[PDB]
Amino acid sequence: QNYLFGCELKADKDYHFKVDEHQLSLRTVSLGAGAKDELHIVEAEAMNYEGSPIKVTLATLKMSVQPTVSLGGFEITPPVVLRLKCGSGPVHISGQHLVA
Template identity: 55%
Template sequence: AGLPKLGCQLQAGKEVRFNPEDDNYDHQLSVRMACVDPTTKDELNVVEIEGQDSEGQKVKAVLATLKPSSLPSVCLGGFEITPPVVFRLRSGSGPVHISGQHLVIMEGDQSFDEDEEEEEEEEEEEETLTTAKKRPALVTQKLSVSSGIN
């Protein structure tokens, strides 16, 4: 299971398009990472992304600037954009790898989403309780080590 993964390789003079079928769902592209390939020449590789603004006008922006010797990869932290999207190298010869996830937003049964949110909240509460229980043990260990040194 899991979310569909996206992976593509950019090279000079080639574009990569992401435009899923119109299937009555909303789609988002969550871009996670950009990195150079081990075979990439030590030159500046500028990754450009082209999308649309809320009015449907084309918008271009630099997604990442990579150089194998100084910045071989960058974590984009889930940069989200609505398709259609075009990736290209504005400069450099590549290859540069882009990875991320294709998110499909389904509308419909809201009760399922609410149940899922409640389960996530319960899991977070359990994690918080577990973390809270573990912390005093760590402090106790530190104190006993300190008292053993004196």
């Protein structure tokens, strides 16, 4: 079963996705209306095989080159932390919350 999901990433804020079973599918990554035409890199934080957490790069954006990146159903087992590694933002993210 699935539910919509979305988050807005602003510079220096982490977006925590944890649930208090589940999986999280990432669809699109899009720059906001006010974002600066600078490089925007979006980082995701969740643990790897060997038990420890890590940061991965989902997408590298730029308004005048590539505003939106589609991941195709990138899923990560919660908890996951979404953040901008560089770039004012905002940067939108969407996908689905897969449950049960």
